[PDB]
Amino acid sequence: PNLTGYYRFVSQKNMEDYLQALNISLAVRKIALLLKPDKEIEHQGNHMTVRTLSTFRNYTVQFDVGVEFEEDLRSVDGRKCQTIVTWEEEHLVCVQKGEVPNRGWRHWLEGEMLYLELTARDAVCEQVFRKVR
Ligand SMILES: C=C(C)[C@@H]1CCC(C)=C[C@H]1c1c(O)cc(O)cc1CCCCC
């Protein structure tokens, strides 16, 4: 599955649980829950760039599938992670090893629908995006 596209926010669920699990303060979560970010993906070979785009903050990550890298998440929750992305069947699976247990995420594609499950500690967030065209 090639994931290149621009994907427009559709919905989210339990994003607050996930933000709490990353130790994000109350004031910052209040605002972050109002963002409705898009995802832009460039997927060429087994290199991917993944952009989370919002009116106030972008977060970008680049990686080769299967190669561990240091992911600078300081603009998100203040941490760095040793991060690895893999293909597990048709799911793109990310484990972000560090201080926070059970931290990572899953993408999968179903037609125009890009699903995203984000996990941290006991928390699970589900986001959905719609591809354009
Ligand atoms: C880049 C952003 C739009 C923000 C940046 C600030 C925080 C605390 C969370 C991110 C966030 C947010 O506030 C709401 C979301 O729906 C998704 C994400 C991106 C989460 C990063 C995943 C590794």
Side-chain angles (χ1 to χ4, degrees):
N2 189 275
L3 292 185
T4 300
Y6 193 100
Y7 301 82
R8 202 171 283 178
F9 185 94
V10 175
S11 66
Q12 71 184 6
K13 190 194 66 184
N14 298 318
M15 176 59 76
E16 183 145 43
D17 294 343
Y18 176 75
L19 296 175
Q20 295 179 337
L22 297 174
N23 305 107
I24 288 157
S25 75
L26 186 276
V28 175
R29 301 195 305 267
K30 177 202 174 66
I31 291 155
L33 292 170
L34 302 167
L35 303 178
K36 292 174 179 71
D38 298 336
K39 298 277 168 185
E40 194 189 18
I41 299 172
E42 306 166 9
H43 179 191
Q44 31 196 44
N46 94 324
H47 186 81
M48 293 185 41
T49 303
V50 179
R51 294 184 236 278
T52 309
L53 304 169
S54 83
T55 44
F56 287 89
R57 279 290 299 277
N58 299 344
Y59 176 68
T60 298
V61 60
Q62 293 190 302
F63 52 85
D64 297 312
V65 164
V67 187
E68 189 180 61
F69 63 107
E70 187 182 78
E71 186 183 359
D72 181 3
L73 286 152
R74 283 177 305 175
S75 73
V76 170
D77 71 318
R79 303 183 173 95
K80 296 162 156 304
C81 281
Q82 294 295 303
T83 292
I84 174 65
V85 187
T86 53
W87 283 110
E88 300 179 8
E89 289 70 52
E90 268 86 71
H91 294 232
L92 184 75
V93 180
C94 176
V95 177
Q96 297 161 314
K97 297 184 175 70
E99 181 192 322
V100 180
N102 204 23
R103 195 190 175 153
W105 51 255
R106 296 180 146 257
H107 269 305
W108 67 102
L109 190 59
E110 171 169 41
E112 299 186 341
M113 307 298 274
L114 176 65
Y115 295 87
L116 176 57
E117 175 180 82
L118 299 150
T119 66
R121 306 191 197 282
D122 59 333
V124 178
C125 169
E126 181 161 331
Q127 298 186 304
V128 197
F129 310 90
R130 186 176 265 110
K131 191 185 206 291
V132 185
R133 300 164 83 193

